[PDB]
């Protein structure tokens, strides 16, 4: 995705429709990165709690 | 006196049974509360 975004953000020849498509792809990538950041923060919370809690909620 | 005694004994028996039933009725709630709090904690954990 990042290779595609970098390849198309630099291509002025994509036109307004191409730029809009690249923008949509970048927006979806931003949502994905938000999700990945949320997952990382949850993993950080699991690391911070330190307990191998055999609870069903523990991040395995 | 005999009639009174027999009637009194019957009434005493009936009253004893009624008191037993009333105490049983007035003395499941714990189980339902436990289940509700368990549901609440499971919902909290899943949502979190």
UniProtKB/Swiss-Prot annotation, chain A:
Component of the gamma-tubulin ring complex (gTuRC) consisting of TUBGCP2, TUBGCP3, TUBGCP4, TUBGCP5 and TUBGCP6 and gamma-tubulin TUBG1 or TUBG2. TUBGCP2, TUBGCP3, TUBGCP4, TUBGCP5 and TUBGCP6 assemble in a 5:5:2:1:1 stoichiometry; each is associated with a gamma-tubulin, thereby arranging 14 gamma-tubulins in a helical manner. Gamma-tubulin at the first position is blocked by TUBGCP3 at the last position, allowing 13 protafilaments to grow into a microtubule. It comes from Homo sapiens (Human). It is found in: Cytoplasm, Cytoskeleton, Microtubule organizing center, Centrosome. The gene is TUBGCP3. It comes from the Eukaryota. Belongs to the TUBGCP family. Ubiquitously expressed. The chain holds residues 304 to 363 of 907 of the full protein. Component of the gamma-tubulin ring complex (gTuRC) which mediates microtubule nucleation. The gTuRC regulates the minus-end nucleation of alpha-beta tubulin heterodimers that grow into microtubule protafilaments, a critical step in centrosome duplication and spindle formation. This is Gamma-tubulin complex component 3.
UniProtKB/Swiss-Prot annotation, chain B:
The modification Phosphoserine is found at residue 27. Transmembrane segments: none annotated. It comes from the Eukaryota. Phosphorylated NEDD1 can interact with gamma-tubulin for targeting the gamma-tubulin ring complex (gTuRC) to the centrosome, an important step for spindle formation. It is found in: Cytoplasm, Cytoskeleton, Microtubule organizing center, Centrosome. Required for mitosis progression. Promotes the nucleation of microtubules from the spindle. Interacts with FAM29A. Interacts with HSPA1A and HSPA1B. Interacts with gamma-tubulin in a HSPA1A/B-dependent manner. This is Protein NEDD1. The lineage of its organism: Eukaryota, Metazoa, Chordata, Craniata, Vertebrata. The gene is NEDD1.
């Amino acid at each position: 995705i990042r290779r595609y975004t970098d390849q198309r953000s630099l291509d002025r020849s994509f036109g307004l429709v191409g730029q809009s498509f690249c923008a949509a792809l970048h927006q979806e990538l931003r949502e994905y990165y938000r999700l990945l950041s949320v997952l990382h923060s949850q993993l950080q919370l699991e690391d911070d709690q330190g307990v191998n809690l055999g609870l069903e909620s523990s991040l395995t | 006196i005999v009639n009174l005694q027999v009637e009194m004994i019957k009434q005493f028996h009936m009253q004893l049974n009624e008191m037993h039933s009333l105490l049983e009725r007035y003395s499941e709630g714990l189980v339902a509360e436990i289940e509700r709090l368990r549901e609440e904690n499971k919902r909290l954990r899943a949502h979190f």
